[PDB]
Amino acid sequence: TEEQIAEFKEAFSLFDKDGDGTITTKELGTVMRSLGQNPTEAELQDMINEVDADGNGTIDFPEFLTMMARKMKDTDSEEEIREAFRVFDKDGNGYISAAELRHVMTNLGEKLTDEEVDEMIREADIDGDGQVNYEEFVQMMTAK
Amino acid sequence: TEEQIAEFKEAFSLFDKDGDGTITTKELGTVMRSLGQNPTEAELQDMINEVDADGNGTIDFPEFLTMMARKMKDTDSEEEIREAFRVFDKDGNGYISAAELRHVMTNLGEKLTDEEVDEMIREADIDGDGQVNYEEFVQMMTAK
Amino acid sequence: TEEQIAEFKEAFSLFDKDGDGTITTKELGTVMRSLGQNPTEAELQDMINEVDADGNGTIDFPEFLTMMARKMKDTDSEEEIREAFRVFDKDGNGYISAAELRHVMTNLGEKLTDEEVDEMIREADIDGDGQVNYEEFVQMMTAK
Amino acid sequence: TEEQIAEFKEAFSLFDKDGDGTITTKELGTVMRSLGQNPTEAELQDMINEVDADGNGTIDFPEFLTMMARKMKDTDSEEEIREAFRVFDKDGNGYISAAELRHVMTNLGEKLTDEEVDEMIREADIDGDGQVNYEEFVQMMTAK
Amino acid sequence: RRNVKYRRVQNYLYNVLERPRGWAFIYHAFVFLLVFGCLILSVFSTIPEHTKLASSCLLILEFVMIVVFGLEFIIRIWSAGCCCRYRGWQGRLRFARKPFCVIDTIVLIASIAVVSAKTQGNIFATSALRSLRFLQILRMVRMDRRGGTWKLLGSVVYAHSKELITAWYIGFLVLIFSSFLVYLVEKDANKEFSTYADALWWGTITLTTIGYGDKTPLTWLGRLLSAGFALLGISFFALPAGILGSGFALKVQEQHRQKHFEKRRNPAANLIQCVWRSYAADTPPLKTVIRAIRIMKFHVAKRKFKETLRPYDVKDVIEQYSAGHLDMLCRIKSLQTRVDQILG
Amino acid sequence: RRNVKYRRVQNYLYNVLERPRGWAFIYHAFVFLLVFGCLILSVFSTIPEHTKLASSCLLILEFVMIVVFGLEFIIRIWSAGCCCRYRGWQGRLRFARKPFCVIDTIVLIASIAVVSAKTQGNIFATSALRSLRFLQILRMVRMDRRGGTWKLLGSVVYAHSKELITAWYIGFLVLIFSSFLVYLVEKDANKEFSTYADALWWGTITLTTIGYGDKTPLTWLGRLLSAGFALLGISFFALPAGILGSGFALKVQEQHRQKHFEKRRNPAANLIQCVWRSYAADTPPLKTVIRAIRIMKFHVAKRKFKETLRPYDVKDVIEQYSAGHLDMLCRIKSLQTRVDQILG
Amino acid sequence: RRNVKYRRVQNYLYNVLERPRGWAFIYHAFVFLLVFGCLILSVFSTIPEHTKLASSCLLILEFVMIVVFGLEFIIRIWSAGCCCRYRGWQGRLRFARKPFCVIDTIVLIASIAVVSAKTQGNIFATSALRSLRFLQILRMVRMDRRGGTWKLLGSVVYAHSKELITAWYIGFLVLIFSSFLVYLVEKDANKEFSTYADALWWGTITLTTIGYGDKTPLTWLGRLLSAGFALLGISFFALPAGILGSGFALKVQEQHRQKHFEKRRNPAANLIQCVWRSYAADTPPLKTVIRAIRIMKFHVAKRKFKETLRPYDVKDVIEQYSAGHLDMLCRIKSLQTRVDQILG
Amino acid sequence: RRNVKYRRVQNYLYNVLERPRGWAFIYHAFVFLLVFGCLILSVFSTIPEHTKLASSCLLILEFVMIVVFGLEFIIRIWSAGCCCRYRGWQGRLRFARKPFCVIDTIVLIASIAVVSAKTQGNIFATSALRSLRFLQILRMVRMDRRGGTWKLLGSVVYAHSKELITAWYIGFLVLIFSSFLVYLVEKDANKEFSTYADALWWGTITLTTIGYGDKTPLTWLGRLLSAGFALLGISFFALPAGILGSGFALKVQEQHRQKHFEKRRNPAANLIQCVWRSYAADTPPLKTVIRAIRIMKFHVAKRKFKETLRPYDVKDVIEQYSAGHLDMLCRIKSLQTRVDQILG
Ligand SMILES: CCCCCCCC(=O)OC[C@H](COP(=O)(O)O[C@@H]1[C@H](O)[C@H](O)[C@@H](OP(=O)(O)O)[C@H](OP(=O)(O)O)[C@H]1O)OC(=O)CCCCCCC
């Protein structure tokens, strides 16, 4: 994984922008401020807390490597996403409406771009009484 | 309904006072400020939300037309008003006192003018042990 | 009751200090401010609300007369005071300690003067295992 | 106990630093401010309330003597400490992990110095699957 | 006056008949006692011994119910003008097609036919009367309003479907097994556990705590197995009654709590206020705009009331709590920001 | 001293008699055991075998209760001065007309008459005594205070009226139907299901899980129908016991919770404080004004206490929550407006 | 289209088979009725009288179930492609090893063998068939999903372990004691309380409210003791049913409340949003950084959802309350300090 | 090492014996099964038929329990050093006087004597053994810890005392009345309702849903009265079981909720922290002052923990709510006043 570890080291160098070796809240916030995201202090706090496991308050290079190495496609993660989709299942028949899903994504939580939600809708077979099998979405977003 | 649609268009022109075609919170508030009502921002927000069904944030002419076309005399509306009156029914015998009703209207909610509550009392047969059949009020205010 | 009504009229004249005939919050507050009590606005509000029964916001002379005419010695009032004393009854045997009562009066609620609580203690037979029959207090303070 | 009472009198003289004979919140706070602890007003209030039993608001010399005379090794105190340790007992088998205990002391409550928690760990037999019998700690800290 | 009085008597009679409360319950209890006594008398007439006195006493009840029920039907038809939607010939006809009213008239004509045939006394007629006697039970049936008992029972059963099913399955298993074992233990010693059907009957009766006593185990091993499985299966078979009873008590508790903290007052007051405002408003253009605003306020209050139809629960309290918390949060953050600007 | 001591003994005896708590319950339990033993002895005397020994042993109880109850009535009359409203001849007479006291004296004279007639031994007299023996049950009756048991039972039944009624109706239907079907299935094969009255008796006993066993179905189709309807109707007939028991448990839980979080402390303290203030106040005009204020404070505290009579519920907690929320809202909006004015 | 339609029919059939809801429950109820009728017919065939008609009617059911179940197994195997993990020969084989599926095929081949041997009619074969008939009960067994009934029953029993144990111990004591006393009171007068084993049997049946009636006390002292201990032990023996039923009702109430106020909405929305963001992002370096951030957001939302798995309780409400309180406290103390600095 | 290992084995054995959790429950269940099998074997030996095989099999159990229990007592005495308060001869003697331990040794010597006398075989000896066999039940008795079952049952009964009493009184009344009426209705027609004692026995058995069937009403009026009073009294007699079961379920629910939201964490952490601080502190005068402060902090944490002993309820939540509300109120009023001063 020499290519992968080299990419991870380059990414860490871009993140910290210095030779300190520890990722602080200020630098992580600036990384996205360069893109005009305006991160919150609590947002950066949970960003740092999710990589490190010792509670030092900074993201060390081995911790970031451990975070990146693990694969998103996991049984626990797949079940969590499946139940997240089932949250909006009607009659327990495993069907979620396309338009209802669009409205839910647009209004609740971090609003998705209209075009992006449209691609979500088109990424699978949306016809068939207006319902889309959420498990197809789970399979599409669990393939890594 | 050419007379009715003409009246609705004239009313919309008076409401918006401009050719924009959309009713904003500021203009709707000014409509009543001209009469010295001092509307609240949330009041205007729910005023706009009740006509439109797309969530754009403004009242379009077709939306106002749809709101106006529907008749107040509805089975659901009649039941809602009937239960609203029954809220103050004693012993489950379908009787509400005239004086108790007067006090409730005067104190709770948007206070009614004393003369107006008096007309409410006189609009039906109020005698008969001081109780007034609320269903008579429902019939009077459901006739359109 | 000519002597009594004359006394009530003189008391009302002292209370209002003017010929208006209505007792307002400001004047009632000043009545006790003359004695340095520093009444609260809510205190005066409930003071006025307890005499009048129409909600006008002021104490009329007939309302004050009605308040004064009624006798403190009442079955409902006696029961209320009896249960108030029973609040601190232990084992359901109808006994309240003298020292515990003293501490409760001193700390909880409008603090009583130490000498006044001492007179309360001495007003009845306090000996007999340190308990005082609260019903004796009820009889003493229900005799008018 | 002439040596003990002499030590207590000297300690009280150091505490109050004056001949008033009563310990006030300000002086008690200054006692620790000399060591840079920065006590809180509520902290000093409960400090005073725990010695005196009359509610005067100050610690009298007899009250401090009564507080000091009583022995920490008590059946009630031993049971309280035992249940405090059992708070973190898993499976009801009377075992508490060393590392979990270290983390709990470090994070929750008044943080303990890392070296001090290390001595806590070493004060008894910590090996044996990583669990330490809390009752050994109770015996060590109940011996006076 | 006189016609208004007539209107009143009709309203009062309509409430005592269709919407009982208080004394109306005493009248309905009287009618229920009459119907139940009729059923008891019919059952007694079934007995050959008492069929003589019971027949005559029951005949009296026939006419008693007949006359009483005919009078009640006449009053109900004459009444039901309380809503005024059933006034006039067409309104009375519309009322008469109510399922309970059509049922009542059918029972009425059946009773009339029973009396007339008892007068005639034909063989086939009298057999038809022995059969048509049960109809008075429809009077017992009409008693409930829109089958409220059935709806409540079904609601509570459905809510506890998993527990009733789980419990019943486990109990059935227990029964089958215990029946079988005893049967093995007693197939030969006892002549009453001859077939497994007999053992199943014994187990059913045993676990259901009926215990007729026709079949009981005799071998001591059989009695030991019967005791153990009796304890288990008895708990299981009595389970559904406890589950349903507890569910009923909890639902009553919930219902009571919701009634105490119902949200009807403020929406109702606002609704009536704006409704009367619109009724009054129904310069000219300013008055028309005010009328539109008042009608909109009425519709909004109606929508809020329809929302309040949903019974109060943890959802509503936590919702209002969180709303209040967010309002205070945003307002006080704004105040801090404003004070900061003042500092700047 | 001596008279104050006498007053004390009378107060103590009044509490142990009329307001039992702790040991008074042990004395009342002793009296209950005596009365219950008298009832048991009377029942045994009903039996021709034991009527000899039982009669003599019961005679002893007659006098035992007689002497004990006469002593207790004497103590109760001599006592009851705790309130001092019954002191003196007129007060004792007023006490003696208490319904329970008049009942007690009536039972007392009845027991005296029973003993005297047993002494005389007349035929009609002795028959009257066999009839007058039950009266000691009024002692069991007087036991409860103002029929608290009846009031509690009625309250819980009324609260769950719909469920008891729904359940009972459904169960009745089940019974009738099952009885009938078995009857059809077994009218001929079984000689005990000869009439529908017999089938109704079998169904009643079957679903009520009594199961005497006098009537049991013999045909296997009858046994299958009996098993199915047994499961259904047994659940329904056992339902009312579960509903009422659960309702009792829930009401106990609610009473305990309300007791733990009762609101009596602050209103009580304020009431007593202002009451004593007024008692003390009962320049001169300033003192009179202060007296009026203190009497008003006493009346306000009385009104607040009467309000607190209502048991705490979700209503009170949500009410106080909303009140606090509105106070903080208005105050902090005022602070924002003030700071804004400062900015201006 | 056609293959997408085929996919659809397979998905629908998979839901109606493995994840029933609504009409699927009606189909499963039909299959349950068929299996239960088969069991009833087998039991009836046990009876020598009805073994003739019952045998023929049951033979029909053999094939009926056989054909129906073979068809259902074929559909289940052909279906189960809804997840697409069982498509292809290897996927179908993986599905076929499901414990319920292997059980179903075993029952299937057993039924086939029963029919074939009934055709042949060998002695040992027919005995094996009389024994292999019960297997259809595995169809009743497969019915439940992963033994949900057993898991629910065990959960509620374990939660109330102390009460079931306490109650059962006390009841056992009661039984032993009452049995013994009656035995002493009736060891000689009654020939059925000859040994203490007989008394224990009588007590078991008595307290369990079975009351066969084979043994009943005859001596009046025995009847008195039996009545008292009957009241006590009956309460104790009926206790476990009430405890478990109430526990079931309370757990249902809790589950319903938690469902109404479940916390799935916001974490789910955030999770899906960031998951799609990462799927889309999967200058170049800026896009890669955004992809990493979006994947981290997805993982955080997954962690929050896993946290929300824990059912809502007093813990969560009080936790959020205290959190809000601490935020307002710190913020408003900061505002006071800031305003103070302004004063300085 | 070796002695520390010995200490460990002793601690582990002490927990598995006196403080079971998990596998220790499996060992205790094994011992319970052994004792229960001994009781069953003794009961069977009571039977003249099985007294031959049962006697020999039970003899084996005598020694089996004997050897097992002697070993367990030896282990318990050798163990119990977990606390170290029972180490040494004096500590072992102190442990041996534990009521359960003295009971255990008494049962042990009784079993030894039973075996020895069975060896000798004296007449009076063997009678004493038939009597001394029950002692193994003390092993069943010792099972529970400090009579937890009795304490729990008594607590729940006392909490629901009014309902059990109300219910039982009403039920008793029902019984007496129904018995009497049937007796009047059937005193002559039925030979089994000859005396009122017989009617009382029938009513007891009837309402308790035992229904032996020895006495059943024959007259149809008697059957009607029996049915009505059966419904009433059956509900009343089954009431106590439902009340107690529901109370048990509610108490379990409450205990579970309190456990989930127990307040032990922060007081415990503070207590341990300050305790270690004091243990460490046990210039010189500054260190002594710090030691006094740390000991005071330990005592305060102990007091707070003793306060937290009280189970959490509505009281604690409302208390903390009101405290928070008053803090915010006073602080924000102070902020408004301060800002006002700034305006001045
Ligand atoms: C045989 C038929 C039995 C039917 C039942 C017996 C027939 C019968 O109806 O009486 C029961 C009755 C009901 O009690 P009660 O009406 O006072 O119960 C209150 C009543 O429901 C209030 O209206 C409720 O207030 P709200 O609206 O919610 O605001 C209140 O709830 P809450 O405010 O406290 O929260 C309830 O507590 O009062 C007796 O105890 C007399 C016992 C007579 C029994 C005599 C025989 C035992």
Ligand SMILES: CCCCCCCC(=O)OC[C@H](COP(=O)(O)O[C@@H]1[C@H](O)[C@H](O)[C@@H](OP(=O)(O)O)[C@H](OP(=O)(O)O)[C@H]1O)OC(=O)CCCCCCC
């Ligand atoms: C046979 C007669 C049976 C009658 C029942 C048995 C007779 C009997 O009375 O004992 C039960 C008794 C009651 O328990 P206990 O008094 O401690 O119950 C507490 C008591 O009610 C407190 O006063 C309550 O505090 P508070 O005021 O609300 O503030 C507290 O509520 P909470 O603070 O926690 O919230 C209650 O938990 O204690 C036993 O367990 C001994 C079992 C003896 C049983 C021996 C035989 C089994």
